Design a binder for this molecule. Structure first.
Ligand SMILES: C=C1CCN2C(=O)COc3cccc(c3)[C@@H](CCc3ccc(OC)c(OC)c3)OC(=O)[C@@H]3CCCCN3C(=O)C(=O)C(C)(C)COC(=O)[C@H](C)NC(=O)[C@H]2C1
Ligand SMILES: C=C1CCN2C(=O)COc3cccc(c3)[C@@H](CCc3ccc(OC)c(OC)c3)OC(=O)[C@@H]3CCCCN3C(=O)C(=O)C(C)(C)COC(=O)[C@H](C)NC(=O)[C@H]2C1
Lengths: 109, 60, 60, 109
């Protein structure tokens, strides 16, 4: 099945897409495949930032966000080999876990 | 001939090693995190700068 | 025949992945550690409990 | 060369040796092979404890301390494949680093 599937919740501008080397500024909530929340940037009350191309995130995120335009809100369905795969994320994310994110691309720094 | 099986069995050791070490650091970070969430009510500027690192990318 | 080279090339990916992830957590811990050593002079009971975890074994 | 070499600085009791499952309580200073200090339990002002057999430490330590008796002070010379090997320890311990420890086995819990 598909490494990451991206589905629009609300559109972005349709024009401004991340390039490698740019910092993406993002709000997100992450859930297991059965819907159990395990994290939200909104909780720690701060957008999450990362640089595309710098290998800083799981591949579901690198490949997912890269397909969003600024302002877009997407649903990212990530399969295990684009997330934490076999090992999983000790005590938080089981092995072979599919992950769903609700992601908003706020701006590009 | 198929000495690759020796290369293969070596690599498997490396991943069991690396995964143990990864899990260990991660476990420490989680625990430091709960230490913070057990004082997340002290409007503390130092503990807050540690929760920032906790969810940052080493880039920033 | 010698498909082991596919097993081998797979494993090498796993170690490059695991090592990156290990390094990343470790880097966070180091930084949390310097945050502490930059306040190591506040006789703080919370920051002190984090320097304990910092050099503990998950056993204890 | 030898995975870990243990040399007496001062003897222990000669009788009480760690068994697997026991917690070893230890003071230590670690140096690179050229003598650059990089850590001391005495600094953080607390003995370091670990359980033998639980895979909690580099193999130079598991195999090294296991050969000390209570009260002993030893010099542990650990080669890279019993320490951090190729990767090393980011920014602290280079790749293929030989490590020397000054270790004291204080008690067995
Ligand atoms: C205690 C801590 C230790 C681990 N930690 C952090 O390290 C800070 O948050 C991050 C910042 C940048 C990247 C990372 C995570 C990486 C994790 C490390 C990593 C880096 C790269 C990988 O490839 C190249 C990989 O695997 C191939 C793995 O996470 C990601 O990329 C994705 C996409 C970006 C948003 C976070 N992400 C998620 O999935 C999540 O929502 C979390 C944070 C896991 C859910 O919070 C938890 O589980 C527990 C409660 N807290 C943590 O897990 C936090 C706090
Ligand atoms: C910022 C932090 C993140 C990393 N950290 C800790 O995690 C706390 O200290 C430990 C407690 C238990 C075991 C461990 C280290 C492990 C490290 C993880 C590990 C576990 C198992 C391994 O196999 C199975 C392996 O590889 C196969 C690797 O260390 C060891 O076993 C040996 C023998 C016991 C005494 C410590 N040891 C050493 O060498 C050293 O003196 C240090 C601590 C590296 C020198 O301090 C530094 O470098 C920098 C300034 N601070 C750290 O590095 C501290 C603080």
């Amino acid at each position: 099945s598909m490494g990451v599937q991206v589905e629009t919740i609300s559109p972005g501008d349709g024009r401004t897409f991340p390039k490698r080397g740019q910092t993406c500024v993002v709000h997100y909530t992450g859930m297991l495949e059965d819907g159990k929340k395990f994290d939200s940037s909104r909780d720690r009350n701060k957008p999450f930032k990362f640089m595309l191309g710098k290998q800083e995130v799981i591949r579901g995120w690198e490949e997912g966000v890269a397909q969003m335009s600024v302002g877009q809100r997407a649903k990212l369905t990530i399969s295990p080999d684009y997330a934490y795969g076999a090992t999983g994320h000790p005590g938080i994310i089981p092995p072979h876990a599919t992950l769903v994110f609700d992601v908003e691309l706020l701006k590009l720094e | 001939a198929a000495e690759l099986m020796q290369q293969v069995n070596v690599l498997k050791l490396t991943v069991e090693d690396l995964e143990k070490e990864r899990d260990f650091y991660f476990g420490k970070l989680r625990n430091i995190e709960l230490i913070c969430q057990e004082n997340e009510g002290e409007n503390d500027p130092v503990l807050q700068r540690i929760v920032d690192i906790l969810y940052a990318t080493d880039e920033g």
